[PDB]
Design a protein around this ligand. Structure first.
Ligand code: HEM
Length: 388
């Protein structure tokens, strides 16, 4: 079900769930239950449905904390309107497409520099050597991390969000405490000595005396770390593996540089890491996929399953970099849709462009690759490569 087969490849299980009607109540060995929703139409409608809340105040007695919001305290992903509308409007005033555009030259140079620090003709781990350092560098720039704090930031972000498979189970918990204090301290530093980063701009943001609070700023930083590092690291890793697993697609991409933007969207649809949206709670009894779901029940909308729905995408379990249209739901839909669609697309393009220019091949048999044991975030433990 949601064990070894699911961790190695979840899409055959998603196919069974869609074939079974697209909604099922699943239970842990301890009796915690949630509804998994797996068909594109229901996942898309669910994501935006105003009757599906992210606020735990609307959860019922059976709530056990599936697919939690990626931050402590009030944040965009645990609030409904009107409180959500305020935060979104405030943050959108500085998290702008122009900000992302102006970061692209630095992102592209960082990708070239990181890959250039990796030797050729020698097994190298793409994750620790490239796919993790690049987003970590970008999110550090975005949050204005000073150079003296980059080492501690890297260590705690990695322990928090990309743990080793044999990391002590308490280390990531401790990293929550460590990073909360780091982020509180970082906000204080920017409050005193402002720069041109997002955190500084967010502190300056004002709506007729309305401002963002310390807790709101720190919570937003946690959200940025989750999606700007954990999601992006494995978007790159899973994308490279998918390219290596489909040589003909790789050869087409290598022959047509203009294919890259559409190729990244297919790579995202094919194996982006996020399997479920943030848990949702019907504020009323709601018909989902033909089942009347009780108010307050936990509902998991299967983004990854939807991206492989055969009723939308032809041959959905095959990589087709020229797939068109490609209405993948990887960045959400509705009021909570991702702030980072473009940023992710820019970091992915920089990462794949540098890899394509350097040359790369698997250093191991792909069947010997190991996947991290997660329910929500699909990613590789390591990906040994040979660089040109
Ligand atoms: C580039 C870095 C990224 C940043 C800074 C970022 C930022 C955010 C933020 C702030 C939200 C909350 C928006 C809200 O609730 O109003 C969000 C939601 C979301 N992001 Fe991202 N994101 C990034 C990358 C990604 C990636 C790589 C994916 C996966 C393909 C992704 C998928 C999502 C989804 C699905 C949601 C909505 C969750 C839900 O509605 O349950 N994002 N993102």
């Amino acid at each position: 079900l949601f064990g070894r087969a699911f961790h190695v490849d979840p899409y055959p299980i998603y196919a069974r769930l869609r074939a079974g009607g697209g909604i099922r109540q699943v239970s842990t060995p301890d009796g915690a239950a949630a509804w998994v929703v797996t068909r594109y139409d229901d996942v898309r409608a669910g994501l935006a449905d105003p009757r599906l809340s992210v606020d735990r105040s609307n959860a019922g007695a059976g709530y056990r904390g599936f697919s939690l919001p990626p931050a402590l305290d009030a944040n965009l992903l645990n609030l409904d309107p009107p409180d959500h509308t305020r935060l979104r409007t405030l943050i959108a005033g500085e998290f702008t497409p122009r900000r992302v555009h102006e970061l692209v030259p630095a992102i592209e140079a960082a990708a070239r520099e990181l890959l250039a620090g990796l030797p050729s003709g020698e097994p190298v781990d793409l994750i620790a050597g490239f796919a993790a350092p690049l987003p970590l560098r970008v999110i550090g720039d975005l949050l204005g991390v000073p150079p003296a704090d980059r080492a501690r930031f890297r260590g705690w972000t990695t322990t928090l969000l990309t743990p080793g498979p044999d990391q002590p189970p308490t280390a990531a918990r401790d990293a929550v405490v460590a990073m909360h204090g780091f982020l509180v301290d970082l906000v204080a530093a920017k409050r005193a000595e402002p720069g041109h980063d997002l955190l500084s701009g967010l502190i300056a943001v004002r709506d007729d005396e309305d401002r963002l609070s310390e807790a709101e700023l720190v919570s937003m930083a946690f959200l940025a770390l989750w999606a700007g590092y954990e999601n992006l690291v494995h978007l790159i890793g899973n994308g490279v593996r998918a390219l290596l697993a489909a040589p003909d697609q790789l050869a087409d991409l290598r022959s047509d540089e203009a294919l890259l933007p559409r190729a990244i969207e297919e790579l995202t649809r094919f194996d982006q890491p996020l399997q479920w949206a943030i848990r949702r709670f019907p504020t009323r009894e709601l018909d989902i996929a033909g089942v009347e779901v009780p108010a307050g029940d936990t509902v998991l909308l299967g983004i990854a399953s939807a991206n492989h729905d055969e009723t939308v995408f032809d041959l959905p379990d095959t990589l087709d970099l020229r797939r068109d249209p490609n209405p993948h739901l990887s960045y959400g839909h509705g009021i909570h849709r991702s702030f980072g669609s473009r940023l992710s697309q820019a970091e992915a393009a920089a990462a794949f462009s540098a890899l394509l220019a350097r040359g790369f091949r698997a250093a191991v048999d792909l069947a010997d690759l190991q996947w991290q044991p997660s329910f929500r975030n699909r990613g590789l433990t390591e990906l040994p490569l040979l660089l040109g």
